[PDB]
A paper describes a structure:
Abundant filamentous inclusions of tau are characteristic of more than 20 neurodegenerative diseases that are collectively termed tauopathies. Six tau isoforms that range from 352 to 441 amino acids in length are expressed in adult human brain from a single gene by alternative mRNA splicing. Tau filaments consist of a structured core made mostly of the repeat domain, with less structured N- and C-terminal regions forming the fuzzy coat. Here, we report in vitro assembly conditions with recombinant tau that replicate the structures of filaments from both Alzheimer’s disease (AD) and chronic traumatic encephalopathy (CTE), as determined by cryo-EM.
When assembling tau (258–391) at 700 rpm, we observed protofilaments with partial similarity to the GGT fold. The structures were nearly identical at residues 288–322, with an all-atom r.m.s.d. of 1.5 Å, (filament type 38a). It is possible that the absence of a non-proteinaceous co-factor, which was hypothesised to be present inside the GGT fold, precluded formation of bona fide GGT filaments. Addition of heparan sulphate or phosphoglycerate to the assembly buffer did not result in formation of the GGT fold (filament types 39–41). Further experiments are needed to identify the co-factor of GGT. With the exception of the reconstruction for filament type 47a, which showed backbone oxygen atoms indicative of a right-handed filament, all reconstructions of filaments with previously unobserved protofilament folds with resolutions beyond 2.9 Å (i.e. filament types 12a, 27a 38a, 40a, 44a, 45a, and 47a) showed backbone oxygen densities indicative of left-handed filaments. Filament type 39a is the same fold as filament type 40a, which at 2.3 Å resolution was shown to be left-handed.
Author numbering:
A (entry chain A), B (entry chain B), C (entry chain C): 275 to 328
Write the structure that this text describes.
Amino acid sequence: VQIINKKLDLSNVQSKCGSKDNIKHVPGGGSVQIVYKPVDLSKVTSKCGSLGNI
Amino acid sequence: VQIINKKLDLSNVQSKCGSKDNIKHVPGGGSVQIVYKPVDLSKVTSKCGSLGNI
Amino acid sequence: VQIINKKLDLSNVQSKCGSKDNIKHVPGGGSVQIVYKPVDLSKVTSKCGSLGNI
């Protein structure tokens, strides 16, 4: 009758960033959301010799 | 009767960014969402020797 | 009577970005969504020697 997970995670990420969504998840009736002139200018640089497992 | 997951994750990502969606998931009746002149100018550079497993 | 998943993930991605969808999932009746002059000018550079498994 069990639920069994047994999860093993050895995954690798060098550089990780979340989302940059503008307007997101609005249940609010009659509400107003404005995002005015948003800009993403970010620089991400990742340099690696070996990235992995085993 | 079991539910058995047994997940093994050795996955690799060098650079990871989330989504950049403008307007997303609006259940709100009569609501207003404006994203006005959104811009993505971002730069992603990824350099690797070996990326992998085994 | 079981459910069994048994997933093994060895996947590799060098550079990963999510979606950039403009308007997405609107159950809200009578609502207004405007994305006005959206722009993507972003740059992705990926360089690898060896990418794989085994």
